[PDB]
Tab-separated table of N, CA and C in Angstrom:
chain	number	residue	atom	x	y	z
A	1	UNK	N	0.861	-1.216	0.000
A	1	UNK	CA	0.000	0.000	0.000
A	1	UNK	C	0.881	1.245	0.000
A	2	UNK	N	1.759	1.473	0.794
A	2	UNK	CA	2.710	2.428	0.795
A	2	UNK	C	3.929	2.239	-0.206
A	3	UNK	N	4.274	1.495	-0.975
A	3	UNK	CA	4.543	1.605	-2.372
A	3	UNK	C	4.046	2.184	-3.501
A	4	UNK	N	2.420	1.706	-3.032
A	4	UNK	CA	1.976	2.225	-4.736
A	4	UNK	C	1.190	3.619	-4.443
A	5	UNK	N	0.916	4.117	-2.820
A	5	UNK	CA	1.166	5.531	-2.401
A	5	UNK	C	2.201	6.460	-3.136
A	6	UNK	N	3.352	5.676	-3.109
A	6	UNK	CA	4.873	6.535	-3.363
A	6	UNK	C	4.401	6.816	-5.094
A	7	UNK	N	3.996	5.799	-5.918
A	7	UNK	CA	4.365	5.805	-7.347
A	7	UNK	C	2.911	6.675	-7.691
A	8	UNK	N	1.580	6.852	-6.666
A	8	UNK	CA	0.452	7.690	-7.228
A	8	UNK	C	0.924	9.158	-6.858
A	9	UNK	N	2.089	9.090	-5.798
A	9	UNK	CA	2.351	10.312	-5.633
A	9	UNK	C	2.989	11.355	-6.999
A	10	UNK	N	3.835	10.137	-7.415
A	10	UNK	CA	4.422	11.165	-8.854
A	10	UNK	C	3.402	11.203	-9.803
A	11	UNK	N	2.827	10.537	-10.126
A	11	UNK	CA	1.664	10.594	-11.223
A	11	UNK	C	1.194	11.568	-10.671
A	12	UNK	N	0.620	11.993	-9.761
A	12	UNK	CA	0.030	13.081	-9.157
A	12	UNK	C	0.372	14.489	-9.836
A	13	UNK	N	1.614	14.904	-9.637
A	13	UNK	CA	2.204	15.825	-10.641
A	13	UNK	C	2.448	15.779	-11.737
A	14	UNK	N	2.814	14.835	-12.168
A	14	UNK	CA	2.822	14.262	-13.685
A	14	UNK	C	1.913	14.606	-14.444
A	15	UNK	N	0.488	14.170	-13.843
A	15	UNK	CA	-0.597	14.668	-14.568
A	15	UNK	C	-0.758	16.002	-14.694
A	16	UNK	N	-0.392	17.008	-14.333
A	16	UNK	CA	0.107	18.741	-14.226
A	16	UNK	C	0.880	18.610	-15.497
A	17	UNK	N	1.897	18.187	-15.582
A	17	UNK	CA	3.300	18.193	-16.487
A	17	UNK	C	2.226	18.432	-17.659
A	18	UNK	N	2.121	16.467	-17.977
A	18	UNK	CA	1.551	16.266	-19.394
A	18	UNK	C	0.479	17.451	-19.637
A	19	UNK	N	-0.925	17.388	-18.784
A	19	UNK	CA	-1.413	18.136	-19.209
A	19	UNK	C	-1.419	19.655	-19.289
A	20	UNK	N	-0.276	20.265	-18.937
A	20	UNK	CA	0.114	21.684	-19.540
A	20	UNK	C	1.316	21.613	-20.692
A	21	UNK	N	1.602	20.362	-21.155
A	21	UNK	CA	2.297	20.061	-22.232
A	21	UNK	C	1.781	19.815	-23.376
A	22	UNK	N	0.543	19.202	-23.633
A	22	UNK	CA	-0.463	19.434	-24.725
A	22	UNK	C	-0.981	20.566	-24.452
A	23	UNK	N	-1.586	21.344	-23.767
A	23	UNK	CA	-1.903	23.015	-23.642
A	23	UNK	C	-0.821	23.828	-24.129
A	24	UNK	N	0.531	23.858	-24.226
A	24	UNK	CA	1.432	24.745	-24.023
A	24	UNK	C	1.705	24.313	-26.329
A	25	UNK	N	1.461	23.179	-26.439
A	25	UNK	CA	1.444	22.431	-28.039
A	25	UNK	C	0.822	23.177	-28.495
A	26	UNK	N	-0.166	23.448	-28.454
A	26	UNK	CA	-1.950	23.786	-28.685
A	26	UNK	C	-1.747	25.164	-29.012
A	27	UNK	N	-1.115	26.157	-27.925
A	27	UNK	CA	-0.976	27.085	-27.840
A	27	UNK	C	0.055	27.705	-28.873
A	28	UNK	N	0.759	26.698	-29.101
A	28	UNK	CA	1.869	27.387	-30.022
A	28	UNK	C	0.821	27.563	-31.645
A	29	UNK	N	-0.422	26.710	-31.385
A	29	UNK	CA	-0.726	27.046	-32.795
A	29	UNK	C	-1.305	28.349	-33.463
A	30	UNK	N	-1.629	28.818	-32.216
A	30	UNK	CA	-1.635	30.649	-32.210
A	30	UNK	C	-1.564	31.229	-33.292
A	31	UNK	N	-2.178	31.187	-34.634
A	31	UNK	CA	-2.022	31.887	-36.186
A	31	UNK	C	-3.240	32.285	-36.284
B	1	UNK	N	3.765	-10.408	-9.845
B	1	UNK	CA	2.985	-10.478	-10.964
B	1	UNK	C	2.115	-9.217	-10.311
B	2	UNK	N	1.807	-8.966	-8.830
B	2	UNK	CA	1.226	-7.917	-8.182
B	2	UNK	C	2.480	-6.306	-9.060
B	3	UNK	N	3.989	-6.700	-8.978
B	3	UNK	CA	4.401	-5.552	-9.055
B	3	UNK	C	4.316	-5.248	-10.691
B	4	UNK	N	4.431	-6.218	-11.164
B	4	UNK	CA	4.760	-5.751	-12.946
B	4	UNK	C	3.287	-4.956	-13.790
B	5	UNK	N	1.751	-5.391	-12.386
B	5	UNK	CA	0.249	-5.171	-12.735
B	5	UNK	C	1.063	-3.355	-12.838
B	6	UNK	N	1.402	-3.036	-11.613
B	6	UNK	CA	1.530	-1.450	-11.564
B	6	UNK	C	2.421	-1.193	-11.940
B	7	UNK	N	3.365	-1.728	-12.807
B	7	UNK	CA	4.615	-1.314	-13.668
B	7	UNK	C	2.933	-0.972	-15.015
B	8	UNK	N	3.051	-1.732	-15.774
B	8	UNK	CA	2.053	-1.516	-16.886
B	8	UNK	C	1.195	-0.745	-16.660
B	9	UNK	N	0.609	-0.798	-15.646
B	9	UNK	CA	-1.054	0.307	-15.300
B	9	UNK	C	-0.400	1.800	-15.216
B	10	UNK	N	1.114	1.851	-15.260
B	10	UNK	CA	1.841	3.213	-15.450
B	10	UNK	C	1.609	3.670	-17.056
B	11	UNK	N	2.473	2.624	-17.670
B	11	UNK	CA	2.467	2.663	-19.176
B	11	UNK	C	0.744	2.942	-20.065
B	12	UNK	N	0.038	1.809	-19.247
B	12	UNK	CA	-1.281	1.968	-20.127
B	12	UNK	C	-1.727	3.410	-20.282
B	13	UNK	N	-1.831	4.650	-19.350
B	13	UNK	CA	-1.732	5.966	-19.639
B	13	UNK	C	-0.481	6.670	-20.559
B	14	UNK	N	0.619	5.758	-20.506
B	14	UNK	CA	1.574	6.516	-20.685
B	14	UNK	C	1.425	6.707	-22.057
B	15	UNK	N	0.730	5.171	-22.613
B	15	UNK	CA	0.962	5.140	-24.254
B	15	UNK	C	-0.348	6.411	-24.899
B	16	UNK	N	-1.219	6.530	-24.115
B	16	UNK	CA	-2.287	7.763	-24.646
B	16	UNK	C	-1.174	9.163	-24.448
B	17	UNK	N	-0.759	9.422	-23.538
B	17	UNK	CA	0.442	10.656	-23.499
B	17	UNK	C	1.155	10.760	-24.933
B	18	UNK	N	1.900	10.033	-24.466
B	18	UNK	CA	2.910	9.869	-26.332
B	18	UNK	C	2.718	10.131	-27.031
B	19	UNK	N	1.203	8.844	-27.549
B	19	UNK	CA	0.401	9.120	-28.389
B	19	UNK	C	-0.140	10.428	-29.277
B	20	UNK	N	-0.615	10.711	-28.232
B	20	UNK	CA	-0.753	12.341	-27.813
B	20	UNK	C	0.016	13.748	-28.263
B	21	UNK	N	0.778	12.744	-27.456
B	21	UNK	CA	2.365	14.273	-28.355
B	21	UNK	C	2.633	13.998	-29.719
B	22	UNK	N	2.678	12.751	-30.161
B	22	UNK	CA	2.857	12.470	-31.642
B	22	UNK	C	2.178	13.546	-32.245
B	23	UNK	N	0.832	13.116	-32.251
B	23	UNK	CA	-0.477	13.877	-33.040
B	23	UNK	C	-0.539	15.611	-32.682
B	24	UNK	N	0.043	16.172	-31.544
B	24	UNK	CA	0.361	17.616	-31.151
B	24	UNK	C	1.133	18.093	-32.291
B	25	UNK	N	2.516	17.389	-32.135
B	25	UNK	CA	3.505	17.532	-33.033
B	25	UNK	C	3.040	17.775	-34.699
B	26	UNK	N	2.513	16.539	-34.942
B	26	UNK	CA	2.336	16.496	-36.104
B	26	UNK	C	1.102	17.572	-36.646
B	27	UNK	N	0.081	17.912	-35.661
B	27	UNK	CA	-0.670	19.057	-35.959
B	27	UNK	C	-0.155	20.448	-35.619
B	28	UNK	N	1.014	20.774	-35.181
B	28	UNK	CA	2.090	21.616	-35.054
B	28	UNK	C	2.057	22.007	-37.054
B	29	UNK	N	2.271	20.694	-37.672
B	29	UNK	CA	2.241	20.861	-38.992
B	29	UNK	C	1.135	21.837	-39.622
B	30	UNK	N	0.212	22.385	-38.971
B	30	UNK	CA	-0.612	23.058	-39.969
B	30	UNK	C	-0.393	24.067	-40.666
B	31	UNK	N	0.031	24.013	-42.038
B	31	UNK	CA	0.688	24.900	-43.005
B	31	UNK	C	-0.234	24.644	-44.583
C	1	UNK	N	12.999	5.302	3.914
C	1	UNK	CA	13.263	6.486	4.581
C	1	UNK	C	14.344	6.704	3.106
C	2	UNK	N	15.508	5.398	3.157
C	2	UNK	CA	16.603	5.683	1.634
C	2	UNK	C	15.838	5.804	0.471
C	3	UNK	N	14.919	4.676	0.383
C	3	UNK	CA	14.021	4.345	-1.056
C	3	UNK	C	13.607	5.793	-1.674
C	4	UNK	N	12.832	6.638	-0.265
C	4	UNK	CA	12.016	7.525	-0.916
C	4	UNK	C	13.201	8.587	-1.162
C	5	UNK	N	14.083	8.741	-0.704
C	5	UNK	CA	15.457	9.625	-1.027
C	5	UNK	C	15.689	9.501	-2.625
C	6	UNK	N	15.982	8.673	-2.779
C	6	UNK	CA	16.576	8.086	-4.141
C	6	UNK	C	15.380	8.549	-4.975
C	7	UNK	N	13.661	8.058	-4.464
C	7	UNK	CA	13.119	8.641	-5.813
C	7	UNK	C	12.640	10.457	-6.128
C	8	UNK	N	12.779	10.589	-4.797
C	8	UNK	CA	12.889	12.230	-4.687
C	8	UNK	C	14.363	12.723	-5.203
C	9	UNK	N	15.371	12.371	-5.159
C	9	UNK	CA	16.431	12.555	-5.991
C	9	UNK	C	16.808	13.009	-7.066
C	10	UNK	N	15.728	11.796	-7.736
C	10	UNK	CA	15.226	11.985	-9.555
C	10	UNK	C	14.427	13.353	-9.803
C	11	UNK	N	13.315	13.360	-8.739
C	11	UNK	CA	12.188	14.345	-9.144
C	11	UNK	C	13.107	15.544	-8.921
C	12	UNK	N	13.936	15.871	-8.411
C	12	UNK	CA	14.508	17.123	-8.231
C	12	UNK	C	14.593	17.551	-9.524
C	13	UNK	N	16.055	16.678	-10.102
C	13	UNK	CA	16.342	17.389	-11.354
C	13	UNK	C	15.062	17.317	-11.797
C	14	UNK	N	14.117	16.440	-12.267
C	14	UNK	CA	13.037	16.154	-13.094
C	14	UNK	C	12.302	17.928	-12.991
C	15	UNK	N	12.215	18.600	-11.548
C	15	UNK	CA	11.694	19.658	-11.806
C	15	UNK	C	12.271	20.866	-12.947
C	16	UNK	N	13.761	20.866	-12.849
C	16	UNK	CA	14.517	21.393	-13.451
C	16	UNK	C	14.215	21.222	-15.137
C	17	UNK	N	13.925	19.906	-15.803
C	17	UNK	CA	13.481	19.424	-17.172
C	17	UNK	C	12.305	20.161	-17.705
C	18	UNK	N	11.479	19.606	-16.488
C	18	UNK	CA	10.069	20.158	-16.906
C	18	UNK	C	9.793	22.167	-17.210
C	19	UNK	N	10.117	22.518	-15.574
C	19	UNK	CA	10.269	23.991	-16.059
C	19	UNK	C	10.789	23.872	-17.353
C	20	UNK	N	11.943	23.950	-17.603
C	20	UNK	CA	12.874	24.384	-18.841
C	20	UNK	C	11.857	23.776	-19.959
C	21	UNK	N	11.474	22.659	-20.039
C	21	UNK	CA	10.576	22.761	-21.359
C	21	UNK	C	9.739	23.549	-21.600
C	22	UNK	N	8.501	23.764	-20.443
C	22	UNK	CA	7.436	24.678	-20.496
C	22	UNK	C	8.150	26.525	-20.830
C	23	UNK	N	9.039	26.671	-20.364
C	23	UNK	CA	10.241	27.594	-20.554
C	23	UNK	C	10.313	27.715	-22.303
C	24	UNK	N	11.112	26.539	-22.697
C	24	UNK	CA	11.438	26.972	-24.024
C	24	UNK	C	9.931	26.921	-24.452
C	25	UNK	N	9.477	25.611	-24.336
C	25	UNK	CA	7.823	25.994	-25.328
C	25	UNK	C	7.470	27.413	-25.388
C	26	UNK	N	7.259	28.087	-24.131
C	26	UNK	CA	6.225	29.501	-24.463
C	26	UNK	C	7.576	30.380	-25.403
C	27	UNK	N	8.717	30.427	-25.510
C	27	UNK	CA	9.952	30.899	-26.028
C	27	UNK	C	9.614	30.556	-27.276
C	28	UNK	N	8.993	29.668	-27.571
C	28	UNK	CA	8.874	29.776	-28.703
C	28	UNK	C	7.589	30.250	-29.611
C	29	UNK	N	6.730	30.815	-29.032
C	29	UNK	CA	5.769	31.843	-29.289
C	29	UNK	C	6.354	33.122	-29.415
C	30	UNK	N	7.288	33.482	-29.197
C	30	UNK	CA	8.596	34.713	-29.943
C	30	UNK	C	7.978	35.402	-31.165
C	31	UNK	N	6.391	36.145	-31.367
C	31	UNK	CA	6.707	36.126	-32.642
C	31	UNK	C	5.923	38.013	-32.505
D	1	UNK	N	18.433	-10.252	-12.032
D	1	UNK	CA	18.343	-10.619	-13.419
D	1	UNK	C	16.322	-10.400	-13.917
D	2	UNK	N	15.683	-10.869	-13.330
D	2	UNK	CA	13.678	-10.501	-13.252
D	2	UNK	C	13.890	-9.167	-13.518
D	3	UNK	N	14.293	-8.395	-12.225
D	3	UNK	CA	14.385	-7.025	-12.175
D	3	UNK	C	14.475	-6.353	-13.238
D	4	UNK	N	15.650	-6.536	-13.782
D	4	UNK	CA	16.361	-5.517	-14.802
D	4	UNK	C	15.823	-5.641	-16.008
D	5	UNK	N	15.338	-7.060	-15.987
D	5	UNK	CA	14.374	-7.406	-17.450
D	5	UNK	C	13.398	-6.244	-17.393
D	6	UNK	N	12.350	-6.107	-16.798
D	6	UNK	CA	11.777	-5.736	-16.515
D	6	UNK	C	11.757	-4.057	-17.100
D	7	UNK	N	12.703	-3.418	-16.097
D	7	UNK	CA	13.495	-2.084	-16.516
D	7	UNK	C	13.574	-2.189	-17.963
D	8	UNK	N	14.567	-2.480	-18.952
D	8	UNK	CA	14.730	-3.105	-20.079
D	8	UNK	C	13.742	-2.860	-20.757
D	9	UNK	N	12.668	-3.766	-20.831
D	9	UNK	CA	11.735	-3.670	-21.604
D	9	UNK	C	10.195	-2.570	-21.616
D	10	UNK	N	10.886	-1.788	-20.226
D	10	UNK	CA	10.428	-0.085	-20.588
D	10	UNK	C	10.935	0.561	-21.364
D	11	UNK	N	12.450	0.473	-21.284
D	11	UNK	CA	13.419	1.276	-22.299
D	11	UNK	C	13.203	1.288	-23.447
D	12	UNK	N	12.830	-0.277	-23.815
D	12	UNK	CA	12.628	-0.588	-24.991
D	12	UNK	C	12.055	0.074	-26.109
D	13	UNK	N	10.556	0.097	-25.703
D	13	UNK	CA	9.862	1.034	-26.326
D	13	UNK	C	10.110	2.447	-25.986
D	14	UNK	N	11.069	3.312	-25.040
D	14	UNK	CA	11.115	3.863	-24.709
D	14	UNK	C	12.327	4.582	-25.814
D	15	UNK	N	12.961	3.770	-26.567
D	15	UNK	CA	13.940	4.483	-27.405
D	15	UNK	C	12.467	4.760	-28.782
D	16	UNK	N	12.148	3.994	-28.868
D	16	UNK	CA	10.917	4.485	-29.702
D	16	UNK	C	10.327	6.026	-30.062
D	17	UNK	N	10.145	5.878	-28.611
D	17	UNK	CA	8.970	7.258	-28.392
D	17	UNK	C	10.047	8.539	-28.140
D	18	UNK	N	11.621	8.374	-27.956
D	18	UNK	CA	12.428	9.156	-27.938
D	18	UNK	C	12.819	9.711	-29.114
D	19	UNK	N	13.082	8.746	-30.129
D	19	UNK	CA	13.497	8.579	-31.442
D	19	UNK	C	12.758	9.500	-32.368
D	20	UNK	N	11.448	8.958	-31.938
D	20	UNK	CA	10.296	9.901	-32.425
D	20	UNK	C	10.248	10.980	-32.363
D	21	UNK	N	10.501	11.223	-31.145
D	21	UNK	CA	10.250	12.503	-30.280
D	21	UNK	C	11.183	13.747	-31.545
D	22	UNK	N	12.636	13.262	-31.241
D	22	UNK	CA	13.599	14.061	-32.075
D	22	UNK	C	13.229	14.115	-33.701
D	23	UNK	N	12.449	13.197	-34.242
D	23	UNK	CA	12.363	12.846	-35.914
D	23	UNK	C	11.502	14.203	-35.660
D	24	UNK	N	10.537	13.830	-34.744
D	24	UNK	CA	9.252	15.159	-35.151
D	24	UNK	C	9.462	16.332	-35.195
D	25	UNK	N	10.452	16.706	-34.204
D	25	UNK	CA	10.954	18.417	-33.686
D	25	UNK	C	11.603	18.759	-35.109
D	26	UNK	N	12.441	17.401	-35.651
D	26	UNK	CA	13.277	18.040	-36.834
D	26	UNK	C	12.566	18.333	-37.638
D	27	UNK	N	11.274	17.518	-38.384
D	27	UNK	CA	10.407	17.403	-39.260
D	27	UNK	C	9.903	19.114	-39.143
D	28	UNK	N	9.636	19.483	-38.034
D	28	UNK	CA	9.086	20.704	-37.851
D	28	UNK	C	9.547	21.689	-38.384
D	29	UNK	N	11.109	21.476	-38.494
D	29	UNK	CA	11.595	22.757	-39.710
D	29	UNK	C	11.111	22.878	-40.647
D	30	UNK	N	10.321	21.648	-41.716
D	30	UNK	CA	9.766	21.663	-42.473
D	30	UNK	C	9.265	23.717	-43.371
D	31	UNK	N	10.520	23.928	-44.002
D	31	UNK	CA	10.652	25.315	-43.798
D	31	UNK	C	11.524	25.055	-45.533
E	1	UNK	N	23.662	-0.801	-3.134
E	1	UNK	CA	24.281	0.089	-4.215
E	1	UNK	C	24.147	-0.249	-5.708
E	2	UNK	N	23.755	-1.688	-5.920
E	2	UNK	CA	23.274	-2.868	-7.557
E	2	UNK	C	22.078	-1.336	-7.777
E	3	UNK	N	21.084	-1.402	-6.662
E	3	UNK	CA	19.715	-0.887	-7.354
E	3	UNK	C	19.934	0.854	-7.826
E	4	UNK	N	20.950	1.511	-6.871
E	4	UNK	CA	21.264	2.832	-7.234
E	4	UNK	C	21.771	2.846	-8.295
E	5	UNK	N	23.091	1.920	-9.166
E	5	UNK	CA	23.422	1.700	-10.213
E	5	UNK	C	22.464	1.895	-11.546
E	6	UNK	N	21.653	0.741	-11.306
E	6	UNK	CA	20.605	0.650	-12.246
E	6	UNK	C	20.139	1.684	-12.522
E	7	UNK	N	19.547	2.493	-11.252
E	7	UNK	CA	18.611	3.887	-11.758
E	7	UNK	C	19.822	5.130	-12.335
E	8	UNK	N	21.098	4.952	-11.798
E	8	UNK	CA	21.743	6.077	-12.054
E	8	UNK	C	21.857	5.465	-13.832
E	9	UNK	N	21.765	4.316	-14.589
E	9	UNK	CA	21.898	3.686	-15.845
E	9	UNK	C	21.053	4.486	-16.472
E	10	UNK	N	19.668	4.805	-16.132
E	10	UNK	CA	18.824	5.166	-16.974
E	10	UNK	C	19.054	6.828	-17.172
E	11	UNK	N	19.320	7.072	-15.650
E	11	UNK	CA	19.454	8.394	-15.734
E	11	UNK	C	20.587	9.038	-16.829
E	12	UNK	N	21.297	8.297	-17.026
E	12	UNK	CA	22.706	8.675	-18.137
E	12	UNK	C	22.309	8.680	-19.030
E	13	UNK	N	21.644	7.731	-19.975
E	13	UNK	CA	21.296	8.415	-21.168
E	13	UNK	C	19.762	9.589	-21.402
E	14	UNK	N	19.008	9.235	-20.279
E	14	UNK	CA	18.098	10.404	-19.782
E	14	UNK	C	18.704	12.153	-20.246
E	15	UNK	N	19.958	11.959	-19.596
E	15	UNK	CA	20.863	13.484	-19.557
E	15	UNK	C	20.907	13.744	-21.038
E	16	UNK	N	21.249	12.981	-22.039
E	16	UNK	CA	20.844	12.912	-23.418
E	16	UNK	C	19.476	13.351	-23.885
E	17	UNK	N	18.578	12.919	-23.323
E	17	UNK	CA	17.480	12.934	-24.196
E	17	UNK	C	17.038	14.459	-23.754
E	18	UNK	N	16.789	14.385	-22.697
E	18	UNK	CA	16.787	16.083	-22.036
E	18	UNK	C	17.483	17.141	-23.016
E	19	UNK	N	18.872	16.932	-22.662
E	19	UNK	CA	19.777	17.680	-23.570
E	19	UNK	C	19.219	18.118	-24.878
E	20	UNK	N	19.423	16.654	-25.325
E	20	UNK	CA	18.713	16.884	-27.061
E	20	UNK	C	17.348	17.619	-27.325
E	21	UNK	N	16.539	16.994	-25.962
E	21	UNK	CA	15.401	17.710	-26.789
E	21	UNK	C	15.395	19.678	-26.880
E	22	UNK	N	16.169	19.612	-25.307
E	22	UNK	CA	16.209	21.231	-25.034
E	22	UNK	C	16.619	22.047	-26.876
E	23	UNK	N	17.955	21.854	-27.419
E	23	UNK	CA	18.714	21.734	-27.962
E	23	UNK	C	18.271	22.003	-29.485
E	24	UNK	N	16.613	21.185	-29.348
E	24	UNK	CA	16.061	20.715	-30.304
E	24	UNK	C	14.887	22.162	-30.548
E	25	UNK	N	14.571	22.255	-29.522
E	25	UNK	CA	13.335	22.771	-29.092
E	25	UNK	C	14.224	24.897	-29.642
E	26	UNK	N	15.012	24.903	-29.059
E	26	UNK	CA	15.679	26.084	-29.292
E	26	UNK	C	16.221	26.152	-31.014
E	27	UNK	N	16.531	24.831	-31.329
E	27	UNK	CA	16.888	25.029	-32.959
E	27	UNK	C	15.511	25.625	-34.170
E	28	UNK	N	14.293	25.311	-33.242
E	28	UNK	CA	13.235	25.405	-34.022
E	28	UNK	C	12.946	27.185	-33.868
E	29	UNK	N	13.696	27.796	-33.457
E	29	UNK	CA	13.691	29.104	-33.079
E	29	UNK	C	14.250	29.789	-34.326
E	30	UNK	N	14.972	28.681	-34.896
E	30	UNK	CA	15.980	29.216	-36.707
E	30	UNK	C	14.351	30.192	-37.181
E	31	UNK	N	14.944	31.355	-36.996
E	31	UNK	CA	14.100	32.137	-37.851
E	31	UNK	C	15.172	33.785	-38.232
């Protein structure tokens, strides 16, 4: 249980990352 | 076989991410 | 107490990656 | 020796989606 | 110290891919 605590913890932020990494894609299409 | 379930249940999102960026990228292409 | 050292370790630099991408991405709206 | 297999055959596909990664950014000069 | 090895393995060519992409990401700036 406190293993897969540790590994939801990074996904946790991760999911921040990716999804302002397709936003930040998206954004570049700005024309 | 418990640890390799949450090795993969990482990846199974991971491959929609990628995925993901591929098709960003490649719609980056709109010209 | 080591385990979680080691994977907080990674995430350090990892913060360092991430900024800097989101960094260059908007850098590259330069226009 | 389990272990590292394991590791390994993240990488695996993991030079993939790297490989990619760089083909696409270049493709993007498309200029 | 086997398991710190391993992760410091991935992390080495990691420093690569980082690198490159930064590298990559700034070349697309050729304007």
């Amino acid at each position: 249980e406190t293993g897969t605590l540790i590994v939801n913890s990074v996904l946790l932020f991760l999911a921040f990352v990716v999804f302002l990494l397709v936003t930040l894609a998206i954004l570049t299409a700005l024309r």
